[PDB]
Amino acid sequence: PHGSPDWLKVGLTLGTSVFLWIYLIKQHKEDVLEYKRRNGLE
Amino acid sequence: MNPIIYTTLIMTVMSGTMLVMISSHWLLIWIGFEMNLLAMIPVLMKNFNPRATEAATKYFLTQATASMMLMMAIIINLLYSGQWTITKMFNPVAMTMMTMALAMKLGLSPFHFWVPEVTQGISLQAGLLLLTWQKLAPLSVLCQISQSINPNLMLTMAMLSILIGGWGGLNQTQLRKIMAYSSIAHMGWMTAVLPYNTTMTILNLLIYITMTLAMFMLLIHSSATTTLSLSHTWNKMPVITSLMMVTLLSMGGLPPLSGFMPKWMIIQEMTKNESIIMPTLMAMTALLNLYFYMRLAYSSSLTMFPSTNNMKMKWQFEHTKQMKLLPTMIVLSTLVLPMTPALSSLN
Amino acid sequence: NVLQIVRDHWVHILVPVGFVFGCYLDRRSDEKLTAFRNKSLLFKRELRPNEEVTWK
Amino acid sequence: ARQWQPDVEWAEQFGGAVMYPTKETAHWKPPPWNDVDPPK
Amino acid sequence: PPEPTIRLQEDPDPEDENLYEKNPDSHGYDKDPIVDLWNMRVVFFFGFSIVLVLGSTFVAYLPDYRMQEWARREAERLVKYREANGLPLMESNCFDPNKIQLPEDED
Amino acid sequence: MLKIIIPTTMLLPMTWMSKHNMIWINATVHSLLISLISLSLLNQLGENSLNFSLTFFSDSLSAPLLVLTTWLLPLMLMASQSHLSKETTTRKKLYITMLILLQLFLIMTFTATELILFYILFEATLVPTLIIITRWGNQTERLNAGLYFLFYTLAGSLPLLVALVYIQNTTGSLNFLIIHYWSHPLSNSWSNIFMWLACIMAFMVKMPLYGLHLWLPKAHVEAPIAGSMVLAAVLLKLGGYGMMRITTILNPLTNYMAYPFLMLSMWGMIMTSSICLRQTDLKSLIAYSSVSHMALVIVAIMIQTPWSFMGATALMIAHGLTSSMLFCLANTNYERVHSRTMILARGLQTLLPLMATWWLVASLTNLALPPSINLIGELFIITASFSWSNITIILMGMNMMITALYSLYMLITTQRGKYTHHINNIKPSFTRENALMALHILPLLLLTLNPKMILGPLY
Amino acid sequence: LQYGPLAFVLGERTTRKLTETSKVITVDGNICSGKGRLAREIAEKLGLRHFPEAGIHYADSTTGDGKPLDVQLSGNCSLEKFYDDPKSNDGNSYRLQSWLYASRLLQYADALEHLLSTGQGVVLERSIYSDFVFLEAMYRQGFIRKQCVEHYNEVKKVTACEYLPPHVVVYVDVPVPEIQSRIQKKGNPHEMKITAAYLQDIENAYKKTFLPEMSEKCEVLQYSAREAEDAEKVVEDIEYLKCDKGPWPDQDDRTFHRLRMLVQNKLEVLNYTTIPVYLPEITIGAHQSDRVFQKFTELPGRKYSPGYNEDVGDKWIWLK
Amino acid sequence: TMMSGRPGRVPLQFLPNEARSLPPPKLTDPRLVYMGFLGYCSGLIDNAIRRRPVVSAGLHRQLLYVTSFVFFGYYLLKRQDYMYALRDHDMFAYVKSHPEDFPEKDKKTYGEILEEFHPVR
Amino acid sequence: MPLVYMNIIMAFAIALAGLLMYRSHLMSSLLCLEGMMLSLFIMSTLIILNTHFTLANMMPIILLVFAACEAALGLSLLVMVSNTYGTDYVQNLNLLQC
Ligand SMILES: CCCCCCCCCCCCCCCCCC(=O)OC[C@H](COP(=O)([O-])OCC(O)COP(=O)([O-])OC[C@@H](COC(=O)CCCCCCCCCCCCCCCCC)OC(=O)CCCCCCCCCCCCCCCCC)OC(=O)CCCCCCCCCCCCCCCCC
Ligand SMILES: CCCCCCCCCCCCCCCCC[C@@H](O)O[C@H](CO[C@H](O)CCCCCCCCCCCCCCC)COP(=O)(O)OCC[N+](C)(C)C
Ligand SMILES: CCCCCCCCCCCCCCCCC[C@@H](O)O[C@H](CO[C@H](O)CCCCCCCCCCCCCCC)COP(=O)(O)OCC[N+](C)(C)C
Ligand SMILES: CCCCCCCCCCCCCCCCC[C@@H](O)O[C@H](CO[C@H](O)CCCCCCCCCCCCCCC)COP(=O)(O)OCC[N+](C)(C)C
Ligand SMILES: Nc1ncnc2c1ncn2[C@@H]1O[C@H](COP(=O)(O)OP(=O)(O)O)[C@@H](O)[C@H]1O
């Protein structure tokens, strides 16, 4: 109809994407360190 | 009906299925099937008209008969071994009664006759639920006791289902009957691999459910239940017809589409067991399904049919309700062939 | 005019960038098939005084 | 000069209750547009 | 018969358009003269000038990776050796018989 | 091999983000550049192959087909520019998308180190062609044609798939290299006979074999010009490539199993050549001529000698170019007359002389005039067949005579005689059409200078 | 929060909004009668909302901008041609009748939506009911075929079986000769060509098929030309009578929720106006359909959804 | 290979602890890139169905689709790799513990094996 | 396996066959289902009491309860179908055809 960009929904969407990406990066780093520690690489 | 009542009934259907899939006692599995049957009827009869009432009555009769046969098999198996746990059947007569009951619940041939009838009687949303969610519980029970099934009987019913779906879909102008016969053929494809690999059964179920969800949501969006009604869709929303055509190509098993993944894998699995003739007949029979999918694709997007004058008014309006999961369903039912080895996730 | 034809002729650059990316990907995929480098019976060779790998 | 597109007589092939009409199924009538029948 | 003898409301089939009418020097590519001329120019430059000439020259001068000259030089030196040493040119056995262990029949 | 695949994929975003009046120019320029890039796969080895990775490899059988496939797309764009002028921008972009997708599938099909990957892409090519035929075809029969073109193919292709997976259960691999190095003789058994048939019939139906050739005149007559071009130039050669690849595991059973197919081909080439003599449709005539040439290619592959394979490669390339040119000439006539009947527009040499020269050159190269590569392939196959049996020379000579007859009949009917009086809409030929014909014909006469580039891996 | 099941679950019930004044009213009468003035007076006096009679471009007034669109893109019919050549070879008469019925259906859905959403009553001219009377006349004068009226009957059944009829039906009774006098005194050259037989058929099929049928499910107030001038007595008559015979007293919250989901979604309202039944007067060829649809899409604010059209002036597109 | 009853299997555990002994998929894994591409296609189709400018309608929505597809694809790839590692582990252990069923065949060269020759004529 | 169990199973088979003929009277279909559950109850009770499996003394009750609930639903459906035609004849449900 006649609507402005819903800044609430936009903020939630951007925040969800940023949180998911940050969580994925942290998970990958934890996985790499755990694999190296458990297999005696570094 | 009241939206709260509708939500409660849907959650009761889902809770019955979950009770079937989480329990280890035959009585609790029977109770889950009973709960699912009980809460399913008003959902089919949501849009009150004599057709829906007739469909609900046919569905109730078939499913109650199947439940009675299931309880009979449970009692015979208990008689020949004092066991209530879902594992082995312990009797040839109890296993045959059980396979018959689960085939009637699934709609496998020769117990397929109710599927087109009920699907034509009910609306598109009820048909979506009926053809997607109602297969999870009988197939889970079959996956649990697959090592007991006589492969001859299961393979006979699977081949019969594939043949019947292929031949019965060729004669249909109604879209809901086409969906019902497609469901019958896909059930046949699923149950032909249970004796060998239940992982392939689950993979086929997932792919079929994705394609069926996309197809039903496209049919609801362009609210057509007839071939000629679907022929008018291009003059309002051609992109919907294009997506429908690609989805029908996927449903026919044409590579490199997603629908090619199950059959391929199934064929592959069946060749590891020195089974050659049956997969060949299965593929040659699935050609019929592809043929009537192509007829629908011709009628929908590849050619432009005559329209009516009043359609111009429809050009001025947009859908009030939109489906959140339709794009994901389309992409998943069309473009996941490169991700095939992920089936080792034992989906 | 710069910053105007770019918005109009930007599409042309894509085919060449795809070619460069494909060349890089071909080299990258090549880098993982070096199990027999300088190990075949036919071309088993002694390294030069300032050579590390016989091919890349 | 113009690509062929289906006309009314072509589209009417797909308007029956079933494909491939026969003598036994000739009397069959397509279902109502809304899935509601007269109560008589 | 009150019917109009008309099956439906349809556009009449149009007559095909001539590109030479609104534009002599039309090159048959597009109805816009500038786009037409530049489409001609790019087709001719990238098809005849670049691919057809430079590609043909590139194929003509492709290095001898099929090893025809190498094969002829190897054969020349091999013939030179065998003629001088009295050897019977090419041999009938492709592999040395001493490194073949035949199965005894003893029948 | 990704240096060719990635630009072809980038052709799609470049097409869809192009201006409404810049799609043809950009597509043509970048397709020509991709052809130039692909031209550097002709540097082949006398050793094994160009094994780029675990997924893609190049061969001197693959490289000429790849170069032809890349070169065909710009010509198809030029040919399609005319009859799609009154079309919406979105649908023109969709047509170009279909063409690009078909090129991508063909390029990946021809490299495809795996037999299952080859099968998947070999069947993926079936979808864009079907859409092109059934969507942008003019007549009402296009739908029917599509149905034929589909089911025939699948009728042969589903058994192959079964056989394929079966082989991997016994051999353990479907990689061409391991398959070739670890090949073992195929016993003379019923199971092996049916495995042989499953392996062969999929490629046999696509050549097409004489018995199974009915889909081809339908599909070619019904398809638009670009569809006809790609069907005659590249899609028919998928069967030949597949047979040459797969016959390595079918020995020695090929000696016995080849007899029915050899007889079908040697008699059906005569049959289809004679059919061409009584044909009222240009496109149908060119389609039947294609059937005859592919019958000769089938004979070559079944004989399975070095000269047979060299001749088959040369003939496949030469026929692709020649048949594409012939379809383009017929389409230039059709876009003026709108009839597609040979007897209608007559005496066109008096009205369009340069196009008459193009017609003459195309007819001469279809006629296998030496030293064209058409005759190089023809002669190599004929010599191999003569060594196979000296009585084949009768059928080969009859085929040559009938081929000359219908080629010159098609030339004389359309170009010679008196012009039809009531046809007054015949305009001078456009620069686009003349350039299209030249870009078809100059590569053939250049290839006759370096024949070893198209003689395959047994050269 | 657009209306739906969630709003109904949380607080939204339409029975609390009804204050015995909703009472949807529909005024009728002949072609040239003072039904519009009487309807407007009723709407002003009762405090209800007036809906001017639906025309060729009624749907144009509720979509995009309210400005009407071109005739070839909206309706593809004209009343002036129907008056000039009622027996035209292109089937303008039945195309006009069907488009007008679809407009009536859209306007009735809009009125029902307004009443069920706000509780305020509405006043209408000719509704989906009594729209057939013109059709009947067109059949008896020979302007349309019997297949046309059969297709009209099918569409009318499958569409009008879904709505609640008006509480009050108001009819203005004016005889044919004085209507004709009004027509000549009007001055419209196309309006001049109406015969007396056409008006007589309209009135006869009007008070011989529409009055008894609404008498059994609605409350009808017949008025003459003289006694329709004074709206005070009409308002008094409307207020005095109480509706307890129709379907309205049997409605409740869940039936109202169903109807409110129905009256929204104008696409689902108009679903059966384009049923695949091929009458030459209304079926349109594939080529013309494609051309006209492409022309409609190229309209300024019609390529995308209402809020996503840059040329009209919609901003912030990339964040919506 | 039915591993449903494999001993020491926690019932509803998506990724067991021992799966942490395996190298995680790289963030630039081609399969992760394909999952992101699938999310992008879903965003484009979402824009197209709702009649919005397909390429540039909602950037937040397309970003969310891509991100969610990448997230689920990463975890799915981990589970896939773990299951294949279990299959190989079990197969090698079974071959080790059953030496009589997988014998060491004698090494024979082609110079001492007689293969039938079939001339092509 | 005694003769009593076979007699009960044959009663179950007869009830199922009766449900399968469909002469008329969907009412009779519901009767056949109820006879089937009666035979099920009897035979399960006999098996459970014979083996002294104390806890499964629950399940006949349970079975009974659930079956009767089903019957109620079925009866309701019957009424509505009859409410359309005035009779419960099986052959009246011929509107939907395969
Ligand atoms: C092999 C794998 C590799 C390739 C992958 C291929 C798949 C990828 C994409 C998958 C799907 C996603 C997109 C589909 C959404 C559809 C949207 C659409 O309609 O298009 C309009 C839209 C523009 O038009 P618009 O003004 O916005 O609105 C017009 C309306 O949308 C509607 O317009 P309209 O109403 O005016 O016209 C109506 C039209 C509209 O109907 C359609 O447009 C059809 C849409 C396609 C169906 C999608 C199905 C789902 C996926 C199937 C994939 C199949 C592949 C398998 C092989 C089988 C081949 C079929 O329908 C018809 O005309 C009916 C007749 C059609 C003939 C029969 C139908 C055949 C369709 C088959 C198409 C298959 C390929 C599609 C490619 C994408 C096309 C946009 O097109 C686009 O711009 C989208 C294209 C993608 C944008 C790319 C942006 C990236 C560029 C910059 C980055 C550079 C990259 C590299 C980075 C580094 C560089 C430095
Ligand atoms: C068809 C395309 C894919 C669609 C799938 C739906 C996508 C959305 C699902 C979102 C994530 C769901 C995962 C649930 C979180 C934890 C699940 C965990 O607790 O359960 C595990 C189970 O994990 C799941 O089974 C794996 C789900 C992964 C499904 C994807 C594979 C599809 C095949 C590849 C096609 C490409 C699709 C990729 C794009 C989506 C353990 O199950 P277990 O109690 O031990 O055994 C019971 C099942 N048995 C009997 C079959 C063995
Ligand atoms: C109008 C009349 C003409 C006017 C002009 C008069 C002059 C005419 C003279 C030209 C024709 C006469 C023939 C004379 C031939 C001379 C050139 C020839 O000798 O070169 C050939 C070379 O030609 C090329 O090999 C063949 C052309 C390449 C073909 C590629 C096609 C272009 C790509 C476009 C895509 C097409 C797709 C086709 C699918 C495969 C053979 O060379 P070669 O003896 O070996 O060794 C070269 C030198 N070395 C020793 C250093 C290596
Ligand atoms: C239709 C358009 C073209 C389609 C493609 C046509 C090409 C397919 C033709 C198939 C090739 C031949 C099939 C089998 C060839 C083997 C030779 C055998 O048939 O002949 C004799 C076999 O004798 C008899 O022929 C037995 C078979 C008789 C039954 C076959 C039906 C005959 C006509 C049917 C033709 C229909 C073909 C199409 C079916 C849809 C040999 O005697 P014998 O030494 O004992 O057998 C040696 C082989 N062994 C060792 C494996 C046992
Ligand atoms: N269903 C219909 N069919 C044909 N014409 C109609 C229809 N409805 C309204 N009209 C035309 O609309 C015009 C205005 O309607 P009318 O009530 O007669 O005038 P007024 O606006 O003064 O009340 C009239 O010429 C009438 O014929």
From TrEMBL, chain A:
Q: Which key words are in the record?
A: Electron transport, Membrane, Mitochondrion, Mitochondrion inner membrane, Respiratory chain, Transit peptide, Transmembrane, Transmembrane helix, Transport
| Family classification | Belongs to the complex I NDUFC1 subunit family.
Question: Which taxonomic lineage does the organism of this UniProt entry have?
Answer: Eukaryota, Metazoa, Chordata, Craniata, Vertebrata
What name does the UniProt record give this protein?
NADH dehydrogenase [ubiquinone] 1 subunit C1, mitochondrial
> In which broad location class does this protein mainly occur, judging by the first location in its UniProt entry?
mitochondrion
Q: Which domain of life is it from?
A: Eukaryota
Instruction: Kindly list the places in or outside the cell where this protein is found, as annotated in its UniProt entry.
Output: Mitochondrion inner membrane
Q: Which GO terms describe its cellular component?
A: mitochondrial inner membrane; respiratory chain complex I
UniProt keyword Lyase present? no
Q: Which gene encodes it?
A: NDUFC1
Q: What does this protein do?
A: Accessory subunit of the mitochondrial membrane respiratory chain NADH dehydrogenase (Complex I), that is believed not to be involved in catalysis. Complex I functions in the transfer of electrons from NADH to the respiratory chain. The immediate electron acceptor for the enzyme is believed to be ubiquinone.
Q: How does it assemble?
A: Complex I is composed of 45 different subunits.
The annotated topology with respect to the bilayer is: Single-pass membrane protein
Automatic annotation (TrEMBL), chain F:
Q: Where is it localised?
A: Mitochondrion membrane
Name the domain of life this protein comes from: Eukaryota
Q: What is its EC number?
A: 7.1.1.2
Q: What is its main location?
A: mitochondrion
Q: What class of enzyme is it?
A: translocase
What positions does the domain NADH:ubiquinone oxidoreductase chain 4 N-terminal occupy? 1-109
Q: Which GO terms describe its biological process?
A: ATP synthesis coupled electron transport
| Molecular functions per Gene Ontology | NADH dehydrogenase (ubiquinone) activity
GO CC term, one of those recorded: mitochondrial membrane
InterPro entries linked:
NADH4_N, NADH_Q_OxRdtase_chainM/4, NADH_UbQ_OxRdtase, ND/Mrp_TM
Keywords from the UniProt entry:
Electron transport, Membrane, Mitochondrion, NAD, Respiratory chain, Translocase, Transmembrane, Transmembrane helix, Transport, Ubiquinone
Which reaction is catalysed here?
A: a ubiquinone + NADH + 5 H(+)(in) = a ubiquinol + NAD(+) + 4 H(+)(out)
- Membrane-crossing residues? 21-41, 61-80, 92-110, 116-133, 145-167, 193-216, 223-244, 256-277, 284-303, 309-330, 351-369, 389-412, 433-449
Bilayer topology: Multi-pass membrane protein
- What biological function has been recorded for the protein in this entry? Core subunit of the mitochondrial membrane respiratory chain NADH dehydrogenase (Complex I) which catalyzes electron transfer from NADH through the respiratory chain, using ubiquinone as an electron acceptor. Essential for the catalytic activity and assembly of complex I.
Annotated NCBIfam families: NDH_I_M (TIGR01972)
* Family assignment from sequence similarity: Belongs to the complex I subunit 4 family.
What binding partners and quaternary form does the record give? Core subunit of respiratory chain NADH dehydrogenase (Complex I) which is composed of 45 different subunits.
Protein name, per record: NADH-ubiquinone oxidoreductase chain 4
Organism of this sequence: Sus scrofa
- Its gene is NADH4
Automatic annotation (TrEMBL), chain G:
The organism's superkingdom is given as Eukaryota
Q: Where is the Deoxynucleoside kinase domain?
A: 25-238
Positions bound to Mg(2+) 2 = K35, E53, E125
User: What are the cysteine partners in each disulfide bond?
Assistant: C218-C243
UniProt-listed CDD domains: NDUO42
Where GTP 2 is bound, by residue?
A: C32, S33, G34, K35, G36, Y83, Q97, R104, R126, F134
- Which parts of the sequence bind GTP 1? C32, S33, G34, K35, G36, Y83, Q97, R104, R126, D131, F134, M138, E191
Binding locations of Mg(2+) 3 = E53
Entry's Gene Ontology BP terms: mitochondrial electron transport, NADH to ubiquinone
Query: Keywords for this entry?
Result: Electron transport, FAD, Flavoprotein, GTP-binding, Metal-binding, Mitochondrion, Nucleotide-binding, Phosphoprotein, Respiratory chain, Transit peptide, Transport, Ubiquinone
Q: Which residues bind ADP?
A: C32, K35, Y83, Q97, R104, R126, D131, F134, K186, E191
Where would you find this protein in the cell? Mitochondrion matrix
Look up the record and name the cofactor or cofactors this protein needs. Answer: FAD
GO CC terms for this protein? mitochondrial matrix
Give residues annotated as binding GTP 4.
C32, S33, G34, K35, G36, Y83, Q97, R104, R126, F134, K186
Q: Where does GTP 3 bind?
A: C32, S33, G34, K35, G36, Y83, Q97, R104, R126, D131, F134, E191
Entry similarity comment: Belongs to the complex I NDUFA10 subunit family.
Q: What does this protein do?
A: Accessory subunit of the mitochondrial membrane respiratory chain NADH dehydrogenase (Complex I), that is believed not to be involved in catalysis. Complex I functions in the transfer of electrons from NADH to the respiratory chain. The immediate electron acceptor for the enzyme is believed to be ubiquinone.
Which PANTHER family does the annotation name?
DEOXYNUCLEOSIDE KINASE, NADH DEHYDROGENASE [UBIQUINONE] 1 ALPHA SUBCOMPLEX SUBUNIT 10, MITOCHONDRIAL
Official protein name in the record: NADH dehydrogenase [ubiquinone] 1 alpha subcomplex subunit 10, mitochondrial
Organism equals Sus scrofa
TrEMBL record, chain H:
Q: Report what the protein is called.
A: NADH dehydrogenase [ubiquinone] 1 subunit C2
Q: In its UniProt record, which GO terms are filed under biological process?
A: mitochondrial electron transport, NADH to ubiquinone; mitochondrial respiratory chain complex I assembly
Q: Which residues cross the membrane?
A: 61-77
Lineage, broadest ranks: Eukaryota, Metazoa, Chordata, Craniata, Vertebrata
Question: Record's family?
Answer: Belongs to the complex I NDUFC2 subunit family.
Function summary: Accessory subunit of the mitochondrial membrane respiratory chain NADH dehydrogenase (Complex I), that is believed not to be involved in catalysis. Complex I functions in the transfer of electrons from NADH to the respiratory chain. The immediate electron acceptor for the enzyme is believed to be ubiquinone.
Give compartment(s).
Mitochondrion inner membrane
Q: Membrane topology type, per the record?
A: Single-pass membrane protein
Provide the alphabetized UniProt keywords. Answer: Electron transport, Membrane, Mitochondrion, Mitochondrion inner membrane, Respiratory chain, Transmembrane, Transmembrane helix, Transport, Ubiquinone
Q: Which GO terms describe its cellular component?
A: mitochondrial inner membrane; respiratory chain complex I
- The principal localisation class reads mitochondrion
Organism, as annotated:
Sus scrofa
One of the Pfam families matching this protein, by short name: NDUF_C2
Record's InterPro entries? Answer: NDUC2
